[PDB]
Amino acid sequence: ASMTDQQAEARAFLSEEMIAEFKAAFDMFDADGGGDISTKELGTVMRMLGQNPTKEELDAIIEEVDEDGSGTIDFEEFLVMMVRQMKEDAKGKSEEELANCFRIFDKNADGFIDIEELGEILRATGEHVIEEDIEDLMKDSDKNNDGRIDFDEFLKMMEGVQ
Length: 162
Fold this sequence. Notes:
Keywords: EF-hand, calcium-binding protein
CATH superfamily of the largest domain: EF-hand
Oligomer: monomer
Entry title: NMR solution structure of calcium saturated skeletal muscle troponin C
Helix content: 55-70%
Distance between the termini: 47 Å
Assembly: monomeric
PDB class: calcium-binding protein
Radius of gyration: 23 Å
Number of domains: 2
Order of helices and strands: HHHHHHHHHH
Structural class: mainly alpha
Name: troponin C
Number of strands: 0
Strand content: under 5%
Number of helices: 10
Largest sheet: none
CATH class of the largest domain: Mainly Alpha
CATH architecture of the largest domain: Orthogonal Bundle
């Protein structure tokens, strides 16, 4: 077992108790395989539902999963797939409610929030705030610091507003 850096991490993400439940669905696509799934085995499982996909088309679907460059689908490859979906950050990306409030902040209708828009908006409350604290707050919330706040950063921006 060599060249298992990302696999040895996504594998440790689920214990043998979780891996067992994932093995039930994995063995389904693994109908005529043997521990791993292949292109032909996938096409046969798709036809079980009633879909008749292409074999060469399914081969490309596995090529994307072959991050290291194996060729067919493995069991730990099936586990890392669940490891790339529990990313809570991308789980809240579907926040359609945040997209509505997000557009409220950009009253200029540009797509992202600017410091000029949030400056007078926050100062309009009347509190004696300083521009040195407002400007630093914007650059401190953006880990990459692009200049404006986009819907991507908006997720964590409205994640904990206490």
